[PDB]
Design a protein around this motif. Sequence first.
Motif, mmCIF file in Angstrom:
data_model
loop_
_atom_site.group_PDB
_atom_site.id
_atom_site.type_symbol
_atom_site.label_atom_id
_atom_site.label_comp_id
_atom_site.label_asym_id
_atom_site.label_seq_id
_atom_site.Cartn_x
_atom_site.Cartn_y
_atom_site.Cartn_z
ATOM 1 N N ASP A 212 0.878 -1.303 -0.069
ATOM 2 C CA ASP A 212 -0.159 0.023 -0.008
ATOM 3 C C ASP A 212 0.869 1.248 0.110
ATOM 4 O O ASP A 212 0.604 2.161 0.925
ATOM 5 C CB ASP A 212 -0.622 -0.029 1.166
ATOM 6 C CG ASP A 212 -2.009 0.915 1.440
ATOM 7 O OD1 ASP A 212 -2.439 1.347 0.408
ATOM 8 O OD2 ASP A 212 -2.252 1.238 2.814
ATOM 9 N N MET A 213 1.685 1.155 -0.968
ATOM 10 C CA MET A 213 2.794 2.406 -0.982
ATOM 11 C C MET A 213 2.166 3.763 -1.163
ATOM 12 O O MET A 213 2.447 4.640 -0.496
ATOM 13 C CB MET A 213 3.789 1.852 -1.813
ATOM 14 C CG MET A 213 4.996 1.388 -1.193
ATOM 15 S SD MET A 213 6.277 1.551 -2.188
ATOM 16 C CE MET A 213 6.079 0.681 -3.764
ATOM 17 N N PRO A 214 1.270 3.954 -2.030
ATOM 18 C CA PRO A 214 0.463 5.150 -2.433
ATOM 19 C C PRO A 214 0.029 5.744 -0.980
ATOM 20 O O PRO A 214 0.151 6.929 -0.863
ATOM 21 C CB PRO A 214 -0.508 4.601 -3.421
ATOM 22 C CG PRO A 214 0.234 3.513 -4.089
ATOM 23 C CD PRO A 214 0.794 2.671 -2.818
ATOM 24 N N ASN A 215 -0.556 4.942 -0.349
ATOM 25 C CA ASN A 215 -1.171 5.402 0.915
ATOM 26 C C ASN A 215 -0.039 5.490 1.991
ATOM 27 O O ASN A 215 -0.116 6.739 2.644
ATOM 28 C CB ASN A 215 -2.422 4.265 1.155
ATOM 29 C CG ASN A 215 -3.494 5.017 0.640
ATOM 30 O OD1 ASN A 215 -3.856 4.889 -0.465
ATOM 31 N ND2 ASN A 215 -4.081 6.121 1.617
ATOM 32 N N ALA A 216 0.920 4.530 2.138
ATOM 33 C CA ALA A 216 1.736 4.850 3.110
ATOM 34 C C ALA A 216 2.670 6.136 2.928
ATOM 35 O O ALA A 216 2.985 6.698 3.859
ATOM 36 C CB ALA A 216 2.696 3.586 3.384
ATOM 37 N N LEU A 217 2.839 6.514 1.729
ATOM 38 C CA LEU A 217 3.541 7.627 1.234
ATOM 39 C C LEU A 217 2.857 8.887 0.922
ATOM 40 O O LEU A 217 3.367 9.792 0.155
ATOM 41 C CB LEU A 217 4.758 7.119 0.393
ATOM 42 C CG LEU A 217 5.331 5.986 0.408
ATOM 43 C CD1 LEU A 217 5.968 5.408 -0.721
ATOM 44 C CD2 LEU A 217 6.192 6.044 1.537
ATOM 45 N N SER A 218 1.678 8.838 1.052
ATOM 46 C CA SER A 218 0.407 10.090 0.604
ATOM 47 C C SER A 218 1.277 11.517 0.928
ATOM 48 O O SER A 218 1.479 12.421 0.173
ATOM 49 C CB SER A 218 -0.671 10.056 1.310
ATOM 50 O OG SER A 218 -0.671 10.319 2.611
ATOM 51 N N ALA A 219 1.664 11.644 2.179
ATOM 52 C CA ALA A 219 2.024 12.978 2.707
ATOM 53 C C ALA A 219 3.462 13.335 2.000
ATOM 54 O O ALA A 219 3.793 14.416 1.724
ATOM 55 C CB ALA A 219 2.408 12.701 4.390
ATOM 56 N N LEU A 220 4.262 12.110 1.741
ATOM 57 C CA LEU A 220 5.782 12.465 1.211
ATOM 58 C C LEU A 220 5.351 12.810 -0.233
ATOM 59 O O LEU A 220 6.176 13.427 -0.585
ATOM 60 C CB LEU A 220 6.539 11.253 1.519
ATOM 61 C CG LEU A 220 7.626 11.264 2.411
ATOM 62 C CD1 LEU A 220 7.174 11.343 3.752
ATOM 63 C CD2 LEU A 220 8.693 10.184 1.948
ATOM 64 N N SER A 221 4.533 12.303 -0.939
ATOM 65 C CA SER A 221 4.127 12.357 -2.297
ATOM 66 C C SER A 221 3.793 13.984 -2.432
ATOM 67 O O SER A 221 4.206 14.655 -3.571
ATOM 68 C CB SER A 221 2.919 11.638 -2.857
ATOM 69 O OG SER A 221 3.314 10.285 -2.971
ATOM 70 N N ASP A 222 2.925 14.345 -1.500
ATOM 71 C CA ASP A 222 2.382 15.785 -1.361
ATOM 72 C C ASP A 222 3.372 16.697 -1.271
ATOM 73 O O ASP A 222 3.644 17.545 -1.924
ATOM 74 C CB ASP A 222 1.579 15.827 -0.126
ATOM 75 C CG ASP A 222 0.060 15.597 -0.243
ATOM 76 O OD1 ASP A 222 -0.526 15.436 -1.397
ATOM 77 O OD2 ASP A 222 -0.668 15.267 0.848
ATOM 78 N N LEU A 223 4.364 16.392 -0.253
ATOM 79 C CA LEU A 223 5.440 17.506 0.175
ATOM 80 C C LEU A 223 6.404 17.578 -0.985
ATOM 81 O O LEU A 223 6.566 18.762 -1.609
ATOM 82 C CB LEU A 223 6.154 16.738 1.279
ATOM 83 C CG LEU A 223 7.549 17.226 1.714
ATOM 84 C CD1 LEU A 223 7.417 19.036 2.153
ATOM 85 C CD2 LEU A 223 8.131 16.782 2.881
ATOM 86 N N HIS A 224 6.810 16.661 -1.797
ATOM 87 C CA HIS A 224 7.466 16.459 -2.984
ATOM 88 C C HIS A 224 6.970 17.222 -4.105
ATOM 89 O O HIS A 224 7.451 18.014 -4.946
ATOM 90 C CB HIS A 224 8.088 15.179 -3.368
ATOM 91 C CG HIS A 224 9.298 14.664 -2.511
ATOM 92 N ND1 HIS A 224 9.178 13.920 -1.183
ATOM 93 C CD2 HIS A 224 10.603 14.725 -2.511
ATOM 94 C CE1 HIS A 224 10.152 13.956 -0.714
ATOM 95 N NE2 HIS A 224 11.151 14.257 -1.381
ATOM 96 N N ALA A 225 5.566 16.900 -4.384
ATOM 97 C CA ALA A 225 4.973 17.718 -5.480
ATOM 98 C C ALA A 225 4.490 18.854 -5.394
ATOM 99 O O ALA A 225 4.815 19.761 -6.210
ATOM 100 C CB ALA A 225 3.464 16.812 -5.782
ATOM 101 N N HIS A 226 4.208 19.505 -4.092
ATOM 102 C CA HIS A 226 3.847 20.695 -3.999
ATOM 103 C C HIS A 226 4.707 21.622 -3.004
ATOM 104 O O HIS A 226 4.433 23.000 -3.254
ATOM 105 C CB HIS A 226 2.348 20.914 -3.131
ATOM 106 C CG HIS A 226 1.471 20.106 -3.972
ATOM 107 N ND1 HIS A 226 1.158 19.984 -5.080
ATOM 108 C CD2 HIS A 226 0.447 19.073 -3.249
ATOM 109 C CE1 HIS A 226 0.381 18.881 -5.378
ATOM 110 N NE2 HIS A 226 -0.050 18.543 -4.449
ATOM 111 N N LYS A 227 5.606 21.135 -2.262
ATOM 112 C CA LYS A 227 6.557 22.102 -1.772
ATOM 113 C C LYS A 227 8.180 22.085 -2.291
ATOM 114 O O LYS A 227 8.351 22.854 -2.817
ATOM 115 C CB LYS A 227 6.512 21.600 -0.040
ATOM 116 C CG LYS A 227 8.049 22.392 0.666
ATOM 117 C CD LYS A 227 8.164 22.300 2.007
ATOM 118 C CE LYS A 227 9.481 22.746 2.536
ATOM 119 N NZ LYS A 227 9.483 23.397 3.907
ATOM 120 N N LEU A 228 8.890 20.717 -2.293
ATOM 121 C CA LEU A 228 10.132 20.470 -2.690
ATOM 122 C C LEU A 228 10.409 20.741 -4.125
ATOM 123 O O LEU A 228 11.156 21.275 -4.931
ATOM 124 C CB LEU A 228 10.706 19.058 -2.080
ATOM 125 C CG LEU A 228 10.347 18.912 -0.608
ATOM 126 C CD1 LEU A 228 10.604 17.768 -0.233
ATOM 127 C CD2 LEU A 228 11.293 20.032 -0.051
#
Lengths: 146, 146, 141, 141
Positions: free
Chosen positions: D75-91
């Motif tokens: 369930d990677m997509p779910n385990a890493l939601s937040a991280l996906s977010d951070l990288h896509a919208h902040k970093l």
Amino acid sequence: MHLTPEEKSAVTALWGKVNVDEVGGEALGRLLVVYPWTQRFFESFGDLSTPDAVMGNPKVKAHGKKVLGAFSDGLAHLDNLKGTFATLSELHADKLHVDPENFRLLGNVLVCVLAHHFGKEFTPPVQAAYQKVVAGVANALAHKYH
Amino acid sequence: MHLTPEEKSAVTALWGKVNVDEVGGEALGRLLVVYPWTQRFFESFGDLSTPDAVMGNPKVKAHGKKVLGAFSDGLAHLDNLKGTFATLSELHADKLHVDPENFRLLGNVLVCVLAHHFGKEFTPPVQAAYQKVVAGVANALAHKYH
Amino acid sequence: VLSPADKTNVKAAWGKVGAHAGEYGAEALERMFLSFPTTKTYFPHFDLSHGSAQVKGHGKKVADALTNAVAHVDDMPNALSALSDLHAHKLRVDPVNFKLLSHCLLVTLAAHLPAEFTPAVHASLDKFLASVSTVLTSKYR
Amino acid sequence: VLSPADKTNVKAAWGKVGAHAGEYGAEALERMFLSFPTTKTYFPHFDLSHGSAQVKGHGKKVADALTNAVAHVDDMPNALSALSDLHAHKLRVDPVNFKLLSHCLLVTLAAHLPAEFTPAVHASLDKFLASVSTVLTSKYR
Ligand code: HEM
Ligand code: HEM
Ligand code: HEM
Ligand code: HEM
């Protein structure tokens, strides 16, 4: 190359410790296993259906030795890889039709094999010099594509 | 930079027809819109929330014109891009911290912009010449990264 | 992922392609051969000369597949399964080449649809081709 | 798509990493910075000198997230939601860079887990880092 005398000596010195026979066979085989699509050029080698069948295949091992051989000799003309690989560049383009991207995959695989073999010895600075060499070689080999 | 004389004539003939002000704004705006991550460098440009907000933003237009201006100068020194772009390379590296992949994205967007503008005049072979040019410029801009 | 807006954009631009799809497919190929000569290694058996019938023939096939993915925009993985298998198992095209073709298709559309090739549409078409490429490469390993 | 063998291979290998993941995280970053200096553009605020606490610290963070990924391999997509977010919208790290860190991580594992870094395991870890990369850049646009 854009190798520092210091970078040149690191490459050179580690290479001296390499068994081309073993590293060549391992590098080519890992390539066929990690990036399965590279097997498209070696159908005549046999059964590459499994890691085991790839790693054990003598044709793979022997091709691997031929490739690292040529690579090895290129380390002696590090200041003119272009000229050292000109004929090999044409062959690959015009006879073998190998996409140069394969040159880059192998390079990376080669670096993973050296790290594997040398553990400790394969330090960040030493990897950095090898990354420069594998890129250099790949570029030289791809130079004659038209 | 393997620009055949005929490739260089072709780059130059077309470049004669370009309105750098205009192309510059379009190329930069489109970059920010197609690859929104590139917006990371322009948080002081204001509203970049939608395509219209980006494309019409007076700051994007002015910056695009600046960028293409430096590019145009580059086209008068096809011979020495590295030298031509050296201080800019340093600036982008050391002050601005711009990942060089950005230079390749802009080159591709620029090619699409020229295609958009010139239509049928942007023939397969003219595109191929411009592909060599944007790559040469990206490479020159990245030469000072360390 | 393609948003509703993306979907609308793609159906719209592709809509305009209509009957020229085939010709634009061929042109994208030629642009690709000329700009990225390494892609030629996959067509050693083709006459890559200008106006090559093989290229014409091939451009139509590519265009038909794209037209098919547009028709099935909500089920691309299934609509392209067959093609995904072929590329993964027989052709074995290195993944980096998809980006090259995508790029040349975008240049081609730009060159032919000036009024439709807006920033918004450009962005949607780029996400679309990236999605098609992803599907086609999904079964590689 | 990670096969069951892959998930096993990955879990095994990462299993051996154990209490060293942080150090391996730090080492992979150091290898990345030296081999691909363009990657340093994303860390202007860090002291990238050898043995820097900022680098060590970050190394841990990355290592930890990988752990969490191995743990939720299903369930990677779910385990890493937040991280996906951070990288896509902040970093907003350019996607090309993920391949560079992934490679530096393999090199690091290879150098430290000789017995375990078999060809089949090498293949799985690569796929795995690839999936993680896909997840982290899925919301970019
Ligand atoms: C480090 C980069 C490489 C070097 C130095 C290299 C060198 C060589 C050499 C010296 C030969 C001998 C052929 C002859 O002289 O007739 C050869 C053949 C060949 N190489 Fe390359 N090679 C490289 C990379 C690759 C890669 C990555 C592939 C594909 C994955 C490849 C595919 C082939 C094939 C298919 C042949 C023909 C072997 C045969 O006749 O069965 N090469 N290469
Ligand atoms: C053809 C490639 C490019 C050229 C020739 C170019 C040229 C320039 C020039 C002439 C300047 C002004 C220098 C100064 O302030 O002294 C500049 C600034 C800048 N460039 Fe580049 N540029 C290029 C690509 C890019 C790209 C693709 C990006 C980001 C995606 C970028 C980011 C910036 C930023 C953030 C600034 C500073 C803006 C400010 O004043 O706040 N550049 N560039
Ligand atoms: C979005 C991108 C692509 C699409 C939609 C696509 C679609 C297709 C289709 C429909 C066919 C014909 C299969 C048949 O015989 O029915 C085909 C074949 C083929 N494609 Fe792809 N393809 C794509 C990308 C690529 C790329 C990037 C390459 C290499 C640069 C490539 C290389 C080939 C080759 C070598 C064949 C076989 C042609 C022949 O022998 O007739 N494809 N493709
Ligand atoms: C293997 C894939 C990656 C993973 C699992 C990962 C994971 C992380 C984690 C866990 C954080 C910390 C979040 C926090 O501070 O709470 C982070 C932040 C960050 N990542 Fe990623 N990362 C990856 C790839 C990359 C790459 C390739 C780059 C750039 C080359 C990058 C650039 C950054 C930066 C600049 C930060 C913020 C650093 C700071 O200011 O502390 N990441 N990442």
